[PDB]
Amino acid sequence: MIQRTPKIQVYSRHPAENGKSNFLNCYVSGFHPSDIEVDLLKNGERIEKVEHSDLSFSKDCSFYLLYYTEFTPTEKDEYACRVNHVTLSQPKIVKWDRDM
């Protein structure tokens, strides 16, 4: 058996083909086993509608998850990604750096 803790990156992007739209991304990478729970949060609350959840795996059987959705941030609103996995003693909350 092998177990590997996910790396978690939270960032924003505009698709080039629609620059007006902004997406909040949580990239959860290099984890094993594949069992996992990932949410996006707004002001500490679970965002229910997340339109995209793309899972893949590599040759060495690590898993990769891109979890993202369209959003409109304001300076007042705090966003984060919350991840629970077997390798983590408590859910991990990674805050979005608004400049990212």
Structural tokens at position 7: 């790396």
Distance from C-alpha of 82 to C-alpha of 79, rounded to nearest angstrom = 10
> Resolution, rounded to a tenth of an Å?
2.0
Distance from C-alpha of 55 to C-alpha of 64, rounded to nearest angstrom = 6
Structure solved using which method?
X-ray
User: What are the CA-CA distances from residue 13 to residues 17, 24, 25, 59, 88 (Å)?
Assistant: 12, 7, 8, 28, 28
Superfamily name with CATH number, domain 1-100: Immunoglobulins (2.60.40.10)
User: What are the CA-CA distances from residue 96 to residues 15, 34, 40, 56, 74 (Å)?
Assistant: 18, 24, 10, 23, 12
- CB neighbourhood size of 68 (10 A): 22
Q: Is 59 helix (H, G, I), strand (E, B) or coil?
A: coil
For 81, how many CA atoms within 13 A lie in the half-sphere containing its CB? 25
The verdict on whether omega for the bond into residue 6 sits within 30 degrees of 0, i.e. cis, is: no
Among candidates 45, 24, 26, 44, which has minimal Cα distance to 36?
26
Torsion angle of C-alpha atoms 6, 7, 8, 12, degrees rounded to 10 = -130
**From the centroid of its chain, how far is CA 35?**
15
| Domain coordinates in residue numbering, the chain | 1-100
Read off the amino acid at residue 59: K
Q: Strand runs (DSSP E) across the chain, as ranges?
A: 7-13, 23-31, 37-42, 45-46, 52-57, 63-70, 79-84, 92-95
Q: Are 33 and 47 in contact (CB under 8 A)?
A: no
